[PDB]
Amino acid sequence: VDHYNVAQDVVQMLTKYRELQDIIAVLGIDELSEEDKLIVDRARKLVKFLSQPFQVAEVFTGMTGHYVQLDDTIDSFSGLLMGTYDQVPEMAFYMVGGINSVLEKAKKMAEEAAELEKMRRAR
């Protein structure tokens, strides 16, 4: 039942995202409501989060692949829909496998940007 509910919610959110994409093409991305400016964000992370690196492509693309278990998939998407991961950057979900990969990539991004600030603050 949880799997079915999560899948339907994702589909509904994606459908709403397409409808909102029509309106951001009319009034720019502010003029919708607060709710439809949180739907867009969590539904611009779902789209980025649906991409997965395949182990078969390790040689060509270099990046190591991921095999996401079904249990992880349901929880990972379920948490995103509720809004638990509303502070993670959008790009952390692009070509990553599982929720843990999202978090580790966030560490590598937050720490990476830390050096950039110390550089840009200095020099």
Binding site: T84, K107, E111
Partner: peptide
């Protein structure tokens, strides 16, 4: 007021999520 008075795999995600966001706040500070 009473609620304030009173107070494993999922913990790791919470730890990482908290720690991940900990640096995001620190970078903003300085």
């Amino acid at each position: 007021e009473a609620a304030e008075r009173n107070p494993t795999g999922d913990n790791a995600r919470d730890r990482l999520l908290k720690e991940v966001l900990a640096l995001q706040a620190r970078i903003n500070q300085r």
